[PDB]
Every structure is written in structure tokens, then in C-alpha cells.
Amino acid sequence: ATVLLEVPFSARGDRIPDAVAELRTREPIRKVRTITGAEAWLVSSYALCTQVLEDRRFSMKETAAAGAPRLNALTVPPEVVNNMGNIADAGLRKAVMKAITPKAPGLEQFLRDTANSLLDNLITEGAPADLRNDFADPLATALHCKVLGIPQEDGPKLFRSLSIAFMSSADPIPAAKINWDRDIEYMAGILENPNITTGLMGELSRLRKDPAYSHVSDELFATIGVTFFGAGVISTGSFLTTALISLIQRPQLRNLLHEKPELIPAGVEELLRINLSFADGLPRLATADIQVGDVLVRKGELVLVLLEGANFDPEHFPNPGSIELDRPNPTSHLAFGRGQHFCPGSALGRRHAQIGIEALLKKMPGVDLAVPIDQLVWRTRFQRRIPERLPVLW
Numbered sequence: 001a002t003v004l005l006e007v008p009f010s011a012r013g014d015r016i017p018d019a020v021a022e023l024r025t026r027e028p029i030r031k032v033r034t035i036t037g038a039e040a041w042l043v044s045s046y047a048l049c050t051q052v053l054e055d056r057r058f059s060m061k062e063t064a065a066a067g068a069p070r071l072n073a074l075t076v077p078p079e080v081v082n083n084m085g086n087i088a089d090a091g092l093r094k095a096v097m098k099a100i101t102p103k104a105p106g107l108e109q110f111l112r113d114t115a116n117s118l119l120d121n122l123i124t125e126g127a128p129a130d131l132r133n134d135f136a137d138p139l140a141t142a143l144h145c146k147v148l149g150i151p152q153e154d155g156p157k158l159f160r161s162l163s164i165a166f167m168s169s170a171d172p173i174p175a176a177k178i179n180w181d182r183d184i185e186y187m188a189g190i191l192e193n194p195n196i197t198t199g200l201m202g203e204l205s206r207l208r209k210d211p212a213y214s215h216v217s218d219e220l221f222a223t224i225g226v227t228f229f230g231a232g233v234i235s236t237g238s239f240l241t242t243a244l245i246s247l248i249q250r251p252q253l254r255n256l257l258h259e260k261p262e263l264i265p266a267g268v269e270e271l272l273r274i275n276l277s278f279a280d281g282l283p284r285l286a287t288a289d290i291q292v293g294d295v296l297v298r299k300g301e302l303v304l305v306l307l308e309g310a311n312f313d314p315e316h317f318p319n320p321g322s323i324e325l326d327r328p329n330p331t332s333h334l335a336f337g338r339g340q341h342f343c344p345g346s347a348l349g350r351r352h353a354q355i356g357i358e359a360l361l362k363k364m365p366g367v368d369l370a371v372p373i374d375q376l377v378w379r380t381r382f383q384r385r386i387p388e389r390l391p392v393l394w
């Protein structure tokens with residue numbers, strides 16, 4: 001007697017389990033059990049992942065409904081699962097998306113300056129260096145303080161909420177509410193602070209006092225700050241960290257991008273495609289009976305969209321484990337999702353990684369792991385896959 005297949009399969013972010021390819025071939029939608037004990041449908045082919053993400057009857061909002069089968073416990077108030085919907089309904093979607101592009105004057109230069117300063121400090125201190133805690137995550141934090149218009153010195157405290165906020169837990173987490181309420185209070189004070197005039201929070205502060213927004217709640221304005229800081233920092237920091245591993249393990253690619261930095265955008269797009277930073281499939285709740293492959297998913301059931309199932313599918317990306325800079329379909333991966341909930345920070349996330357890699361390859365052309373790859377410690381029961389430390393020499 002066996003048990004129902006459990007998800008997630010592995011917290012290791014340096015390699016995909018051989019098991020994913022076997023599953024995609026044999027059963028590209030199949031029943032699994034999540035850490036809560038709920039049953040769910042795990043979808044692992046490119047075609048069926050795209051189908052689910054482009055059909056809004058598979059709803060992200062309804063995953064928050066009381067009594068639903070759950071992937072994990074909520075770490076935000078349930079109305080925040082509808083965050084982008086709430087922003088759109090408030091008439092704020094265009095302004096929010098405009099504030100988080102990489103295109104504001106001076107933003108790219110600030111990113112380069114910050115990355116170079118972090119790297120110079122590591123070089124001064126001498127190898128080994130930890131590229132997660134002392135490069136990728138501080139670069140992500142600095143970027144999001146600048147994008148939000150808030151003081152750089154406020155970044156570390158906001159950052160330290162995230163090791164709990166993005167937990168993937170069977171049960172509610174008391175610390176998550178403590179930190180959430182504190183971080184909301186912080187952002188509410190930012191909106192009242194006359195010195196905050198730039199970035200996303202400076203723009204929201206003006207719109208809040210504009211008559212066209214007089215009935216938008218103060219709670220939503222503060223929530224936009226907390227959520228875009230948290231999603232952006234955890235996503236860019238975790239992605240850059242595991243991209244650095246993929247790059248360091250490919251010395252030929254490392255040297256090519258060092259020699260020809262104009263290929264860095266194509267390289268980052270492939271690093272996005274093969275990235276294992278998302279620890280769980282993306283969750284959706286069926287709001288109707290819907291045919292997905294050989295399975296009739298029933299109303300009220302949970303569906304999990306496995307991004308690396310799609311992104312390593314050889315029917316869409318031949319030789320899927322190979323980084324190839326000349327693919328005919330290079331941005332067609334699902335690293336930023338697809339459909340209604342496509343990542344609103346995709347351009348900024350690309351530029352964060354491109355600039356971080358450019359700066360690293362120039363400052364540390366001989367970068368290499370300082371420990372055997374199996375010695376990395378992979379964070380468990382978390383919404384991202386990340387090594388607790390990333391020790392390198394150069």
C-alpha cells in the first residue's frame with residue numbers, strides 16, 4: 001500500500017528531479033496531496049499549464065475562500081489574495097505599473113552603483129563571500145526601497161518579515177500577522193510623511209489626496225506598499241540567487257557573457273526559463289467543471305500549475321535543460337506566469353538580474369563556488385527555493 005503522491009517534490013533549487021519528466025509524459029495532470037492534507041490537481045505540461053493560466057474560471061481569488069482545499073495557509077488577509085483586482089477596481093493599476101518599470105531616470109544607474117558597491121565591499125573583506133545574504137538580497141532590497149521612494153535605511157527591517165511572510169505552511173503563522181500589521185502601520189506613516197515625494201509611495205501619496213480617489217481606502221494604499229515590496233524583493237532576490245548558481249556552474253557561459261555582455265539579456269531570459277525559484281505550483285480554484293487533458297476538474301477543486309513542468313517541456317523547448325541563446329521562442333516561458341495574473345514587475349525583475357550579473361562578471365570574472373554544490377542548505381516549507389548561504393570565491 002502506497003500513499004497519494006505528495007507535493008512539493010524537492011526543495012532543491014539547483015536541479016529538476018528526474019521525476020518531473022516522467023510525470024509530464026505519463027500523467028500531465030494528476031492527483032496529489034498538499035502539505036495541508038488537501039487533494040489537488042498538479043499540471044506539468046506546457047500546453048495544459050497555459051490552458052489553466054489563461055482560463056479565468058480557474059480563479060486565484062477563490063483560493064482564499066473559507067473551506068476550500070488549500071495548498072498552504074494564508075499569511076495575508078484573505079482580501080489581499082485579490083490584490084491586483086483591488087488595485088484595478090480602485091483605478092490605480094496604470095499608476096502602479098508605471099512606477100515599477102525600470103525606466104525612471106537614474107534608476108538603472110542606482111542599481112549599478114549599488115551592485116558595484118556591494119561587490120567592492122565583498123572584495124575588500126576577502127573570500128569566501130555569501131552572494132545571497134551579502135549581494136542578491138541587499139540588491140533586491142535597495143532596489144525596492146528606491147522604486148517605492150522610501151528611505152534605504154528602512155529596507156532591512158521590512159526585509160526581515162519575508163522569511164516568515166513567504167512561508168508555505170500547513171497552519172496559520174502567528175508571526176506573519178505580527179509582521180503584517182507592523183508593516184502596514186509603517187506604510188500608512190509613509191503616506192502621511194511629507195518628505196516622501198518620489199517613487200510608488202510618493203505617487204500614491206498624491207493620488208490619495210486627489211478628489212478622483214477620495215473613496216479609496218487608506219488600507220489599500222498601505223497594502224500596495226507592503227505587497228509590492230514583499231513580492232518584488234522575495235522574487236528578485238531569490239531569482240538572482242539561483243540564476244547565479246546556474247551561471248557559476250557553467251564556466252563556458254560565464255566566460256561568454258563576461259566577454260560579450262551584450263548577450264546578457266538573452267542569457268537572463270534562459271536563466272528565467274530554467275529557474276526553480278517557485279517552490280510550489282501556482283494555485284487556482286475551479287469555479288466550474290472544466291476539462292483539462294484527460295481529467296474533468298470539478299467545481300471547488302484545487303489546481304497547481306507547475307512552472308518548471310511547462311518550462312522544461314521538450315515539446316515546447318527542445319533540449320530543455322540546455323541554456324541556448326538562439327531559441328526561436330525565448331520569452332514564451334512561464335517564469336512570470338501567464339494570463340490575468342502575469343507578473344506586473346517583469347521588466348524590473350529582468351533588469352535587476354541583468355545589472356546584477358553584469359556587475360558580478362566585471363568585478364569577479366573568476367567567480368566559483370567555495371563549497372561543493374551538495375553543501376548548499378535549501379530552505380524548506382517556503383514559497384521560494386533558495387540556499388540559506390551561497391559561498392563563493394573568485
Ligand code: HEM
Nearest residue numbers: 084231232235236239282335336337341343344345348349
Ligand atoms: C524575477 C523576478 C520575478 C519573478 C520570477 C516573478 C514571478 C511572478 C509570477 C510567476 C507571478 C504570477 C503568480 C500567479 O499567477 O499566481 C507573479 C505575480 C506578481 N508579481 Fe512577480 N516576479 C518577479 C518580480 C516581481 C517584481 C519586481 C514585483 C514588484 C515590484 C512583482 C510583483 C508581483 C505581483 C504584485 C504579482 C501578482 C499579480 C496578480 O496577481 O495579478 N514581481 N510574479
Ligand SMILES: Cc1cc(C[C@@H]2NC(=O)[C@H](Cc3ccc(O)cc3)NC2=O)ccc1O
Nearest residue numbers: 075076080081083084165166226227230231
Ligand atoms: C505572502 C505575500 C504575498 C504577496 C503578494 C500578494 N498576495 C497574494 O496573495 C496575491 C497573489 C500572489 C502573488 C504573488 C505571490 O508570490 C503570491 C501570491 N497577490 C499579491 O500581490 C505580497 C506580500 C506577502 O507577504
